[PDB]
Amino acid sequence: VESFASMLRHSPLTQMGPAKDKLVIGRIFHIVENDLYIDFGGKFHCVCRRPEVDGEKYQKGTRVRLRLLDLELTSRFLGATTDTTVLEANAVLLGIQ
Amino acid sequence: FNDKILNEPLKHSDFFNVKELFSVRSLFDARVHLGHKAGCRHRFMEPYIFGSRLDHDIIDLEQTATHLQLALNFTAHMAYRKGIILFISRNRQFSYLIENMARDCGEYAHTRYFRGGMLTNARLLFGPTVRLPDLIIFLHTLNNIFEPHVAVRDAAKMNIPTVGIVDTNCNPCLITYPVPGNDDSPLAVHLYCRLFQTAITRAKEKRQQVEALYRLQ
Amino acid sequence: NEDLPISMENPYKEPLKKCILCGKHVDYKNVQLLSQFVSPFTGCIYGRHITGLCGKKQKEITKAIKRAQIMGFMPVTYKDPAYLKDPKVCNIRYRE
Amino acid sequence: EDFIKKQIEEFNIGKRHLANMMGEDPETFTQEDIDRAIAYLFPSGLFEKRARPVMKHPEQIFPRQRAIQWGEDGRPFHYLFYTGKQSYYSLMHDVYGMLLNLEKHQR
Amino acid sequence: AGSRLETVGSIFSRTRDLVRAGVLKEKPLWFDVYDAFPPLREPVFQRPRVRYGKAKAPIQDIWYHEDRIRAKFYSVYGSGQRAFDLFNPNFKSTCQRFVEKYTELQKLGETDEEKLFVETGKALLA
Amino acid sequence: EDFDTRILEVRNVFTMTAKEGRKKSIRVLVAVGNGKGAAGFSIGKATDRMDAFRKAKNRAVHHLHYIERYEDHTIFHDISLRFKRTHIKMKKQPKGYGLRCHRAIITICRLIGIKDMYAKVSGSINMLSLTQGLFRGLSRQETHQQLADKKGLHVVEIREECGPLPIVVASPRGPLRKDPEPEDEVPDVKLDWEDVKTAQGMKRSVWSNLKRAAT
Ligand SMILES: [Zn+2]
Ligand SMILES: [Zn+2]
């Protein structure tokens, strides 16, 4: 039986290291107008605008490639005791496949 | 003598074999270990957090496994003894899933705006002789302003046991069976719905089996 | 036990950001660099939010500017017109 | 309710008694003829058309009393009972579901 | 009756004390299930508090040895066009290839880090 | 039906309205108890005193506590508690000592079943802090079995009435610890100057040990 420490060490979100500028495949799972709600693994989903070029090749299930800038996107402000999470990650859609 | 269909499961440990529905691998692939950042933590969730990876906290999945065993055992026993299990959430991305899960089982779901006094001014709000739930299971303990849900306090005020998935930014304080785990990922929430639905359905079918056996006996 | 984590100081730690003049010697005779951190129209010494200098360097540039202008090296009310052509390093935007 | 049931019985019997005193003792006394018969029987002379007398089936007279939402087990019938707005939230859940499965397919 | 004092103890403690006194005549449905299988911590109210002086959280940072070389890899040879999948377990990225080959030579028997790096660099070049 | 409700404070409470002006509202505090441990207090507010009384008692029965008693007559130990700015100092006392407490504490302890205890209140005597601090301390007593379980040792009694005879009151329900308790010579405990004054006989009051009626 594998221990949770083993599960973690040999895992791909623990071999990714710092999320910034790491290319990642994701799957569109919801579309509102032109906001594509994609995944990429991770705890949160990213939301990206519809790329107008090839702008019908982005449907529910399409595998896309994302740059990834953040995995949770949060910040503390003036009087706050905790962080203001947007419950969403931050990525830039490069294209398909 | 019906104190053998209401006392027997209570001396068999794991009377419903609920230990074979979840493993630390099943949870890891459901992404239960992934938590929030050190900046959205809670002092009372600190005992359940394995550590922090790249300022992103992770939850100890062995502790999640033990807590989930205890939680699913309790849920199975209340569903067997024919309680009322109310599933409460305020997600908005999983409301459809929780109400459909209640309807596929036979339990109940509050996924909408909790009106003040639902469990507390209950006789005036519903009717003089209402049976309040005998177990409230929160799939997401926080409301939409990222604060603890009124029901967690009012369930305790009204002495209703509570099972709840507590993420890193949550207060595992007034929750009888807290289950340290991710509730922000569709795979995690889907696995929780699947596990609770399976427990409740197996519990009710086993209750029918023992009632049939004693009726024939 | 072998895959439990280990106490170490943070890898992937980016080296601290350094100022444009970190390691260089500011001098009052260097009215070409001092003029860069002044305003073309009024001669106003720029702040940290425009220059992007560390505290040590904003202090040395301010003191060298004041020394040179009272010593007869720098104009006070304008940027010597000969230097409205050098590399701009200040985050300000007058024209539109 | 037993109230509703005996009110019904009493309307039916009183409607037949109404056609006797008039002259339409044949069984089919319509609601328009009922309004006609009570108008004459007891002259109104009141400006409010609700303040005048009336003889309808108890159905329209008495309001809609909602049924009991739980049997003798507790155990409320609808799954969305503890919202307190079962019908509205069931309708909203259904409409959201038809929008969802329609998006999966596609006064 | 019941005790709506959510802050004094737990629901178990309140219910046990009241059925001992004799004011809760029937026990609730969940009491015997609690008494059979209690949680690992009784749900008693605790007020959250801000750490003020020299008090720090016990939570540690997860750092493995391979990360010393992982950080070095990205530094020299940046993140390649071979993109991370993340959706599939057992994904072996190019940096994982690098650490595995590097750790190989390490086990075999080598010493200075720079020599280790150039040897595994030529190994991945092959 | 086994529950007795007794008032503790009635106050005529006023607020100002734009149209009416001074608007009276009766604010009452009542305490309910069956002399077996279950007791609790609550505030009722109304425009009519009967309505305030009804609200207060019917709310306190839903907000009861449970007070543990030594031999159903006294408290387990000595309780010193400052609630806000009210200091309540209570001492466990032997049987037949009576309720030598503040009159509100006497009524509350008759509703709880405590028959013999000493109590002195100082600071601000606010009734709605007195009852709350009293219930806080009495519901946060530590019993003999809990002390035995926490320390792993026998909890035994030494009365001067019986003699040198040891009377075991609470033994641990688990294992027995075998390292003896550390005899910390010259203990670091915060003493009360009133207690030390009474011990040394320099507490001269013409009000202290006065012959009063029963309880
Ligand atoms: Zn969360
Ligand atoms: Zn510098």
Curated annotation (Swiss-Prot), chain A:
Domain of life of the source: Eukaryota
Keyword Mitochondrion attributed: yes
Modified residues (N6-acetyllysine): 57
An example Gene Ontology biological process: mitochondrial translation
Key words of the record: Acetylation, Disease variant, Mitochondrion, Phosphoprotein, Primary mitochondrial disease, Ribonucleoprotein, Ribosomal protein, Transit peptide
GO cellular component: mitochondrial inner membrane; mitochondrial small ribosomal subunit; mitochondrion
Similarity comment: Belongs to the bacterial ribosomal protein bS1 family.
UniProt disease annotation: Combined oxidative phosphorylation deficiency 47: An autosomal recessive, multisystemic, mitochondrial disorder characterized by intrauterine growth retardation, swallowing difficulties with failure to thrive, hypoglycemia, dehydration, and hepatomegaly. Additional features include global developmental delay with impaired intellectual development and absent speech, microcephaly, facial dysmorphism, cataract, sensorineural deafness, skeletal features, and cryptorchidism.
Binding partners and assembly: Component of the mitochondrial small ribosomal subunit (mt-SSU). Mature mammalian 55S mitochondrial ribosomes consist of a small (28S) and a large (39S) subunit. The 28S small subunit contains a 12S ribosomal RNA (12S mt-rRNA) and 30 different proteins. The 39S large subunit contains a 16S rRNA (16S mt-rRNA), a copy of mitochondrial valine transfer RNA (mt-tRNA(Val)), which plays an integral structural role, and 52 different proteins.
Span within the parent record: 77 to 173 of 187
UniProtKB/Swiss-Prot annotation, chain B:
Record carries keyword Protease: no
Localization of this protein: Mitochondrion
Residues of the full protein shown: 58 to 274 of 296
Species of the source: Homo sapiens
Disease / disorder: Combined oxidative phosphorylation deficiency 36: An autosomal recessive, multisystem disease resulting from deficiencies of mitochondrial respiratory enzyme complexes and mitochondrial dysfunction. Clinical manifestations include sensorineural hearing impairment, mild developmental delay, hypoglycemia, and intellectual disability.
GO MF: structural constituent of ribosome
Family: Belongs to the universal ribosomal protein uS2 family.
Annotated function: Required for mitoribosome formation and stability, and mitochondrial translation.
Main location: mitochondrion
GO CC, alphabetical: mitochondrial inner membrane; mitochondrial matrix; mitochondrial small ribosomal subunit; mitochondrion
Listed GO biological process terms: mitochondrial ribosome assembly; mitochondrial translation
Keyword Mitochondrion attached: yes
Protein's UniProt name: Small ribosomal subunit protein uS2m
Keyword line: Disease variant, Mitochondrion, Primary mitochondrial disease, Ribonucleoprotein, Ribosomal protein
Swiss-Prot record, chain C:
A Gene Ontology molecular function term of the record: structural constituent of ribosome
Keyword Oxidoreductase attached: no
Swiss-Prot/TrEMBL GO biological process terms: mitochondrial translation; translation
Cellular localization per UniProt: Mitochondrion
GO CC term, one of those recorded: mitochondrion
Coiled coil (UniProt feature): none
Ribonucleoprotein as UniProt keyword: yes
Keywords: Mitochondrion, Ribonucleoprotein, Ribosomal protein, Transit peptide
Protein family per UniProt: Belongs to the bacterial ribosomal protein bS18 family.
Leftover remarks: There are 3 mitochondrial isoforms of bS18 in mammalia, localizing to 3 distinct sites in the mitoribosome. bS18m (bs18c, this protein) binds to the same site as bacterial bS18, mS40 (bS18b) binds to a novel location of the 28S small subunit, and mL66 (bS18a) binds to the 39S large subunit.
Self-association and partners: Component of the mitochondrial small ribosomal subunit (mt-SSU). Mature mammalian 55S mitochondrial ribosomes consist of a small (28S) and a large (39S) subunit. The 28S small subunit contains a 12S ribosomal RNA (12S mt-rRNA) and 30 different proteins. The 39S large subunit contains a 16S rRNA (16S mt-rRNA), a copy of mitochondrial valine transfer RNA (mt-tRNA(Val)), which plays an integral structural role, and 52 different proteins. bS18m has a zinc binding site.
Protein name: Small ribosomal subunit protein bS18m
Protein's organism: Homo sapiens
UniProtKB/Swiss-Prot annotation, chain F:
GO cellular component assignments: mitochondrial inner membrane; mitochondrial small ribosomal subunit; mitochondrion
Positions of the S5 DRBM domain: 3-67
Subcellular location(s) per record: Mitochondrion
Keyword Glycoprotein belongs to the record: no
UniProt keyword annotation of Mitochondrion present: yes
BP-aspect Gene Ontology terms: mitochondrial translation; translation
Listed GO MF terms: RNA binding; structural constituent of ribosome
Keyword line: Mitochondrion, Ribonucleoprotein, Ribosomal protein
Cysteine-cysteine disulfides: none
Subunit structure: Component of the mitochondrial small ribosomal subunit (mt-SSU). Mature mammalian 55S mitochondrial ribosomes consist of a small (28S) and a large (39S) subunit. The 28S small subunit contains a 12S ribosomal RNA (12S mt-rRNA) and 30 different proteins. The 39S large subunit contains a 16S rRNA (16S mt-rRNA), a copy of mitochondrial valine transfer RNA (mt-tRNA(Val)), which plays an integral structural role, and 52 different proteins.
Family the entry assigns: Belongs to the universal ribosomal protein uS5 family.
Protein name in the entry: Small ribosomal subunit protein uS5m
UniProt source species: Homo sapiens
Lineage of producing organism: Eukaryota, Metazoa, Chordata, Craniata, Vertebrata
Gene: MRPS5
Shown stretch of the complete protein: 216 to 430 of 430
